[PDB]
Design a protein around this motif. Structure first.
Motif, mmCIF file in Angstrom:
data_model
loop_
_atom_site.group_PDB
_atom_site.id
_atom_site.type_symbol
_atom_site.label_atom_id
_atom_site.label_comp_id
_atom_site.label_asym_id
_atom_site.label_seq_id
_atom_site.Cartn_x
_atom_site.Cartn_y
_atom_site.Cartn_z
ATOM 1 N N UNK C 41 -11.996 6.901 -0.356
ATOM 2 C CA UNK C 41 -11.143 6.636 0.661
ATOM 3 C C UNK C 41 -9.584 6.638 -0.172
ATOM 4 N N UNK C 42 -8.683 7.273 0.499
ATOM 5 C CA UNK C 42 -7.208 7.179 0.182
ATOM 6 C C UNK C 42 -6.624 6.640 1.492
ATOM 7 N N UNK C 43 -5.956 5.367 1.509
ATOM 8 C CA UNK C 43 -5.311 4.899 2.651
ATOM 9 C C UNK C 43 -3.715 5.042 2.741
ATOM 10 N N UNK C 44 -3.260 5.560 3.650
ATOM 11 C CA UNK C 44 -1.989 5.855 3.642
ATOM 12 C C UNK C 44 -1.240 4.926 4.856
ATOM 13 N N UNK C 45 -0.083 4.432 4.377
ATOM 14 C CA UNK C 45 0.717 3.807 5.472
ATOM 15 C C UNK C 45 2.462 3.864 5.171
ATOM 16 N N UNK C 46 3.014 4.466 6.032
ATOM 17 C CA UNK C 46 4.512 4.543 6.186
ATOM 18 C C UNK C 46 4.793 5.639 4.691
ATOM 19 N N UNK C 47 3.942 6.579 4.507
ATOM 20 C CA UNK C 47 3.974 7.582 3.614
ATOM 21 C C UNK C 47 3.764 6.969 2.256
ATOM 22 N N UNK C 48 3.318 6.022 2.064
ATOM 23 C CA UNK C 48 2.768 5.477 0.729
ATOM 24 C C UNK C 48 1.237 5.519 0.477
ATOM 25 N N UNK C 49 0.897 5.860 -0.645
ATOM 26 C CA UNK C 49 -0.708 5.645 -0.962
ATOM 27 C C UNK C 49 -1.140 4.208 -1.346
ATOM 28 N N UNK C 50 -2.045 3.400 -0.512
ATOM 29 C CA UNK C 50 -1.964 2.060 -0.775
ATOM 30 C C UNK C 50 -2.905 1.853 -2.113
ATOM 31 N N UNK C 51 -2.518 0.840 -3.021
ATOM 32 C CA UNK C 51 -3.384 0.688 -4.109
ATOM 33 C C UNK C 51 -4.077 -0.490 -4.174
ATOM 34 N N UNK C 52 -5.359 -0.330 -4.687
ATOM 35 C CA UNK C 52 -6.351 -1.369 -4.356
ATOM 36 C C UNK C 52 -6.042 -2.771 -4.754
ATOM 37 N N UNK C 53 -5.349 -3.311 -5.728
ATOM 38 C CA UNK C 53 -5.033 -4.469 -6.067
ATOM 39 C C UNK C 53 -4.050 -5.103 -5.731
ATOM 40 N N UNK C 54 -2.973 -4.434 -4.644
ATOM 41 C CA UNK C 54 -2.023 -5.074 -3.779
ATOM 42 C C UNK C 54 -2.583 -5.730 -2.239
ATOM 43 N N UNK C 55 -1.885 -6.533 -1.838
ATOM 44 C CA UNK C 55 -2.404 -7.094 -0.486
ATOM 45 C C UNK C 55 -1.689 -6.194 0.643
ATOM 46 N N UNK C 56 -2.337 -6.226 1.879
ATOM 47 C CA UNK C 56 -1.578 -5.962 3.137
ATOM 48 C C UNK C 56 0.014 -6.078 3.290
ATOM 49 N N UNK C 57 0.003 -7.538 2.813
ATOM 50 C CA UNK C 57 1.413 -8.200 3.028
ATOM 51 C C UNK C 57 2.340 -7.448 2.011
ATOM 52 N N UNK C 58 1.963 -7.031 0.883
ATOM 53 C CA UNK C 58 2.727 -6.697 -0.087
ATOM 54 C C UNK C 58 3.493 -5.327 0.502
ATOM 55 N N UNK C 59 2.958 -4.483 1.402
ATOM 56 C CA UNK C 59 3.290 -3.397 2.204
ATOM 57 C C UNK C 59 3.910 -3.624 3.573
ATOM 58 N N UNK C 60 4.029 -4.905 3.783
ATOM 59 C CA UNK C 60 4.496 -5.267 5.512
ATOM 60 C C UNK C 60 3.788 -4.475 6.242
ATOM 61 N N UNK C 61 2.672 -4.589 6.316
ATOM 62 C CA UNK C 61 1.789 -4.110 7.290
ATOM 63 C C UNK C 61 1.428 -5.218 8.165
ATOM 64 N N UNK C 62 1.917 -5.110 9.629
ATOM 65 C CA UNK C 62 1.817 -5.954 10.527
ATOM 66 C C UNK C 62 0.782 -5.762 11.393
ATOM 67 N N UNK C 63 0.399 -6.684 12.554
ATOM 68 C CA UNK C 63 -0.573 -6.503 13.536
ATOM 69 C C UNK C 63 -0.470 -5.381 14.378
ATOM 70 N N UNK C 64 -1.618 -4.756 14.538
ATOM 71 C CA UNK C 64 -1.543 -3.281 15.316
ATOM 72 C C UNK C 64 -0.938 -2.102 14.740
ATOM 73 N N UNK C 65 -0.918 -2.255 13.415
ATOM 74 C CA UNK C 65 -0.577 -1.093 12.721
ATOM 75 C C UNK C 65 -1.655 -0.308 12.632
ATOM 76 N N UNK C 66 -1.318 1.184 12.084
ATOM 77 C CA UNK C 66 -2.023 2.264 12.244
ATOM 78 C C UNK C 66 -2.172 2.611 10.511
ATOM 79 N N UNK C 67 -3.328 2.623 9.807
ATOM 80 C CA UNK C 67 -3.242 3.322 8.585
ATOM 81 C C UNK C 67 -4.081 4.511 8.671
ATOM 82 N N UNK C 68 -3.779 5.571 7.738
ATOM 83 C CA UNK C 68 -4.290 6.934 7.868
ATOM 84 C C UNK C 68 -5.397 6.915 6.622
#
Lengths: 76, 114, 76
Positions: C41-68
């Protein structure tokens, strides 16, 4: 096989291709479906810029892979 | 100015079977822009001087970051945002003081080049 | 909160998460529900690749967001 092309504006386009297709052909399919001229397209996969005369199989692109599309001369 | 945009001492790792294995060799990670304007992320064996890894990287292709849960606190990963591709490195700088600055520089020159 | 994970085959999966969850956790929920190994799995949000040890809040992912989600196991 289905592949995904992610653009810089957060739009992802799905294409149906065969590994035997050339990069030139892929670019023509993208022009056909989104209207971007092939000369403005830069396709990136696994940190390599894809060259027109090679095929998708040359790069080991398998089903459901995502290529990144950067446009030559990006606004803003 | 100089040849390398960024350089620092670091070892690499390799996947043997399904196992990520640190390579023990003293190495140098560096970023160089060649005259075609392309940006190369490289790893060089310091003893032999052989460049074993040389990857052309475009803006937003990847991110360089610390791997937090390694007790050394000196493992970093070059993660390709598209695909599962990862390359692991381990800092070999004698002091840890500049690890985070090296990492910051990698990201700047890969994702904001001139 | 509900989030959407869009895959390259046009399937979208809905997950129930908390902003405090780590990316590692999210990947485990996706494995649990669709069977994809976290290492693929490679997860992408707002053109960033998400890193395993961070939390969703770190990236400002709010309800009903879509990750790729991009798979591409190996690396070309």
């Amino acid at each position: 096989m289905q592949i995904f092309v992610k653009t810089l504006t957060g739009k992802t386009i799905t294409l149906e291709v065969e590994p035997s297709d050339t990069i030139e052909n892929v670019k023509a399919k993208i022009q056909d479906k989104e209207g971007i001229p092939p000369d403005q397209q830069r396709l990136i996969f696994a940190g390599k810029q894809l060259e027109d005369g090679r095929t998708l199989s040359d790069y080991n692109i398998q089903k459901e892979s995502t290529l990144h599309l950067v446009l030559r001369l990006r606004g803003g | 100015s100089n040849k390398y945009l960024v350089e620092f001492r670091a070892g690499k790792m390799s996947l043997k079977g399904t196992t990520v294995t640190p390579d023990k060799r003293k190495g140098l990670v560096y970023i160089q822009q060649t005259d075609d304007s392309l940006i190369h992320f490289c790893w060089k064996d310091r003893t032999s001087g052989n460049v074993e890894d040389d990857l052309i990287i475009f803006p937003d292709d990847c991110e360089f970051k610390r791997v937090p849960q390694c007790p050394s606190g000196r493992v970093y990963v070059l993660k390709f945002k598209a695909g599962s591709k990862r390359l692991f490195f381990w800092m070999q700088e004698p002091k840890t003081d500049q690890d985070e600055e090296h990492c910051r520089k990698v990201n700047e020159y890969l994702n904001n080049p001139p």
